[PDB]
Amino acid sequence: EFITVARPYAKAAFDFAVEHQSVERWQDMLAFAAEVTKNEQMAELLSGALAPETLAESFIAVAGEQLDENGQNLIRVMAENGRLNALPDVLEQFIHLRAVSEATAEVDVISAAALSEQQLAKISAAMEKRLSRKVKLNAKIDKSVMAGVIIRAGDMVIDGSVRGRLERLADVL
Protein backbone atom coordinates (compact mmCIF):
# COMPACT_ATOMS: atom_id res chain seq x y z
CA GLU A 1 0.00 0.00 0.00
CA PHE A 2 1.35 3.38 -1.06
CA ILE A 3 -0.48 5.73 1.31
CA THR A 4 2.78 7.02 2.73
CA VAL A 5 5.07 7.07 -0.31
CA ALA A 6 2.50 9.02 -2.33
CA ARG A 7 2.30 12.03 -0.02
CA PRO A 8 5.42 13.87 -1.24
CA TYR A 9 4.49 13.47 -4.89
CA ALA A 10 0.87 14.51 -4.41
CA LYS A 11 1.99 17.56 -2.45
CA ALA A 12 4.56 18.56 -5.06
CA ALA A 13 2.13 18.08 -7.94
CA PHE A 14 -0.52 20.15 -6.20
CA ASP A 15 1.85 22.97 -5.25
CA PHE A 16 3.07 23.10 -8.84
CA ALA A 17 -0.44 23.04 -10.30
CA VAL A 18 -1.38 26.00 -8.10
CA GLU A 19 1.52 28.20 -9.24
CA HIS A 20 0.22 27.86 -12.81
CA GLN A 21 -3.54 27.76 -12.14
CA SER A 22 -3.94 24.43 -13.93
CA VAL A 23 -5.39 22.36 -11.08
CA GLU A 24 -8.13 20.92 -13.27
CA ARG A 25 -5.73 19.94 -16.04
CA TRP A 26 -3.37 18.39 -13.51
CA GLN A 27 -6.18 16.40 -11.93
CA ASP A 28 -7.32 15.06 -15.30
CA MET A 29 -3.73 14.29 -16.29
CA LEU A 30 -3.25 12.31 -13.09
CA ALA A 31 -6.56 10.52 -13.58
CA PHE A 32 -5.33 9.38 -16.98
CA ALA A 33 -1.93 8.36 -15.62
CA ALA A 34 -3.54 6.29 -12.86
CA GLU A 35 -5.56 4.48 -15.52
CA VAL A 36 -2.50 3.69 -17.60
CA THR A 37 -1.24 1.82 -14.54
CA LYS A 38 -4.26 -0.49 -14.41
CA ASN A 39 -4.08 -1.89 -17.94
CA GLU A 40 -3.34 -5.60 -17.93
CA GLN A 41 -0.23 -5.33 -20.11
CA MET A 42 1.22 -2.21 -18.50
CA ALA A 43 0.90 -3.66 -15.00
CA GLU A 44 3.05 -6.54 -16.22
CA LEU A 45 5.65 -4.13 -17.53
CA LEU A 46 5.81 -2.08 -14.34
CA SER A 47 6.74 -5.16 -12.31
CA GLY A 48 9.54 -6.62 -14.42
CA ALA A 49 12.87 -4.98 -13.74
CA LEU A 50 13.40 -2.51 -16.56
CA ALA A 51 15.85 0.34 -16.28
CA PRO A 52 13.98 3.38 -14.91
CA GLU A 53 14.62 5.58 -17.94
CA THR A 54 13.36 3.01 -20.45
CA LEU A 55 10.34 2.13 -18.34
CA ALA A 56 9.54 5.82 -18.01
CA GLU A 57 9.82 6.31 -21.77
CA SER A 58 7.62 3.33 -22.63
CA PHE A 59 5.12 4.69 -20.12
CA ILE A 60 5.24 8.18 -21.64
CA ALA A 61 4.70 6.66 -25.07
CA VAL A 62 1.30 5.24 -24.09
CA ALA A 63 0.15 8.70 -22.98
CA GLY A 64 -0.24 11.74 -25.22
CA GLU A 65 -2.64 13.43 -22.78
CA GLN A 66 0.25 14.60 -20.58
CA LEU A 67 1.54 18.11 -21.02
CA ASP A 68 4.97 18.27 -22.53
CA GLU A 69 7.11 19.19 -19.53
CA ASN A 70 5.39 18.78 -16.24
CA GLY A 71 3.41 15.56 -16.46
CA GLN A 72 6.15 13.80 -18.34
CA ASN A 73 8.59 15.05 -15.69
CA LEU A 74 6.49 13.75 -12.80
CA ILE A 75 6.33 10.36 -14.48
CA ARG A 76 10.09 10.41 -14.98
CA VAL A 77 10.78 11.19 -11.32
CA MET A 78 8.41 8.55 -10.01
CA ALA A 79 9.88 6.07 -12.49
CA GLU A 80 13.40 6.89 -11.32
CA ASN A 81 12.32 6.16 -7.77
CA GLY A 82 10.37 3.11 -8.92
CA ARG A 83 6.99 4.35 -7.70
CA LEU A 84 4.81 4.45 -10.81
CA ASN A 85 2.47 2.02 -9.09
CA ALA A 86 1.72 4.77 -6.57
CA LEU A 87 -0.17 6.93 -9.07
CA PRO A 88 -3.66 5.67 -8.14
CA ASP A 89 -2.98 7.07 -4.65
CA VAL A 90 -1.24 10.24 -5.76
CA LEU A 91 -4.54 10.95 -7.47
CA GLU A 92 -6.57 10.43 -4.30
CA GLN A 93 -4.35 12.62 -2.17
CA PHE A 94 -4.33 15.26 -4.90
CA ILE A 95 -8.12 15.28 -4.89
CA HIS A 96 -8.02 15.53 -1.10
CA LEU A 97 -5.56 18.44 -1.06
CA ARG A 98 -7.69 20.18 -3.69
CA ALA A 99 -10.86 19.73 -1.65
CA VAL A 100 -9.05 21.16 1.38
CA SER A 101 -7.71 24.15 -0.56
CA GLU A 102 -11.06 25.05 -2.12
CA ALA A 103 -12.77 24.42 1.25
CA THR A 104 -15.10 21.64 0.17
CA ALA A 105 -16.41 18.46 1.79
CA GLU A 106 -18.45 15.47 0.64
CA VAL A 107 -20.57 13.90 3.38
CA ASP A 108 -22.44 10.60 3.15
CA VAL A 109 -26.03 10.37 4.40
CA ILE A 110 -27.26 6.84 5.08
CA SER A 111 -30.95 6.32 5.76
CA ALA A 112 -33.62 3.66 5.94
CA ALA A 113 -35.26 5.45 3.00
CA ALA A 114 -34.82 8.49 0.80
CA LEU A 115 -35.23 11.88 2.44
CA SER A 116 -37.73 14.65 1.79
CA GLU A 117 -35.34 17.02 -0.02
CA GLN A 118 -36.27 19.52 2.65
CA GLN A 119 -34.53 17.28 5.18
CA LEU A 120 -31.60 17.11 2.76
CA ALA A 121 -31.56 20.90 2.49
CA LYS A 122 -31.50 21.33 6.25
CA ILE A 123 -28.78 18.69 6.57
CA SER A 124 -26.53 20.42 4.05
CA ALA A 125 -27.20 23.79 5.67
CA ALA A 126 -26.34 22.42 9.11
CA MET A 127 -23.15 20.71 7.98
CA GLU A 128 -21.96 23.80 6.08
CA LYS A 129 -21.95 25.25 9.61
CA ARG A 130 -20.41 22.23 11.32
CA LEU A 131 -17.75 22.39 8.59
CA SER A 132 -16.54 25.58 6.95
CA ARG A 133 -16.75 23.75 3.62
CA LYS A 134 -19.45 23.83 0.99
CA VAL A 135 -20.79 20.29 1.27
CA LYS A 136 -22.05 17.89 -1.36
CA LEU A 137 -24.58 15.24 -0.38
CA ASN A 138 -24.85 11.74 -1.81
CA ALA A 139 -27.67 10.12 0.11
CA LYS A 140 -27.58 6.36 0.41
CA ILE A 141 -30.21 3.87 1.52
CA ASP A 142 -29.64 0.98 3.90
CA LYS A 143 -32.41 -1.02 5.53
CA SER A 144 -30.49 -2.57 8.43
CA VAL A 145 -30.62 0.88 9.90
CA MET A 146 -34.36 1.22 10.34
CA ALA A 147 -35.06 4.80 11.43
CA GLY A 148 -33.11 7.99 11.78
CA VAL A 149 -30.06 8.72 9.67
CA ILE A 150 -26.27 8.35 9.67
CA ILE A 151 -24.19 11.35 8.66
CA ARG A 152 -20.61 10.42 7.79
CA ALA A 153 -18.23 13.30 7.02
CA GLY A 154 -14.82 11.82 6.37
CA ASP A 155 -13.87 10.00 9.56
CA MET A 156 -16.53 11.83 11.62
CA VAL A 157 -19.91 10.15 11.96
CA ILE A 158 -23.10 11.11 13.77
CA ASP A 159 -24.92 7.89 14.63
CA GLY A 160 -28.46 9.17 14.50
CA SER A 161 -29.95 5.82 13.53
CA VAL A 162 -32.31 4.02 15.88
CA ARG A 163 -30.30 0.86 15.26
CA GLY A 164 -27.44 2.69 16.93
CA ARG A 165 -29.69 3.56 19.86
CA LEU A 166 -30.68 -0.09 20.27
CA GLU A 167 -27.12 -1.40 20.19
CA ARG A 168 -26.14 1.40 22.59
CA LEU A 169 -28.93 0.56 25.02
CA ALA A 170 -28.38 -3.19 25.00
CA ASP A 171 -24.84 -2.65 26.31
CA VAL A 172 -25.92 -0.32 29.12
CA LEU A 173 -27.53 -3.33 30.79
Partner 1 sequence: NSTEISELIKQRIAQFNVVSEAHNEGTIVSVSDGVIRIHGLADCMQGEMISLPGNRYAIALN
Partner 2 sequence: MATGKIVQVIGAVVDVEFPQDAVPRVYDALEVQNGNERLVLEVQQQLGGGIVRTIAMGSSDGLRRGLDVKDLEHPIEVPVGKATLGRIMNVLGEPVDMKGEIGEEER
Please give the residue ranges that form the binding site for partner 2 (CB under 8 A): 49-51, 54
21 binding partner (options partner 2, partner 1, none; Cβ < 5 to 8 Å by kind) = none
Q: What is the C-alpha separation between 76 and 54, in angstroms, rounded?
A: 10
What letter would DSSP give residue 131?
S
58 binds partner 1 (CB under 8 A): yes
Beta carbons within 8 Å of 63's beta carbon, 6+ residues apart: 32, 33, 36, 71, 75
Task: Name which of 36 and 75 has its Cβ closer to partner 1.
Answer: 36
Task: Name which of 30 and 110 has its Cβ closer to partner 1.
Answer: 30
Task: Name which of 42 and 153 has its Cβ closer to partner 1.
Answer: 42
Task: Name which of 51 and 173 has its Cβ closer to partner 2.
Answer: 51
Sheet of 156-159: strand order equals: 134-141, 104-111, 149-153, 156-159
170 binds partner 1 (CB under 8 A): no
Residues 32-51, mask of contacts with partner 1 (x by CB under 8 A): x--xx--xxxx-xx-xxx--
β partners of residue 110: 140, 150
Ramachandran region, residue 103 (left: φ > 0; alpha: ψ -120 to 50; beta: rest): left
Q: What is the C-alpha separation between 10 and 170, in angstroms, rounded?
A: 45
Interacting span for partner 1 (CB under 8 A) from 14-22, 59-67, 101-109, 123-131: 59-67
Coil vs helix vs strand at 153? strand
Binding site for partner 1 (CB under 8 A): 32, 35-36, 39-42, 44-45, 47-49, 58, 61-63
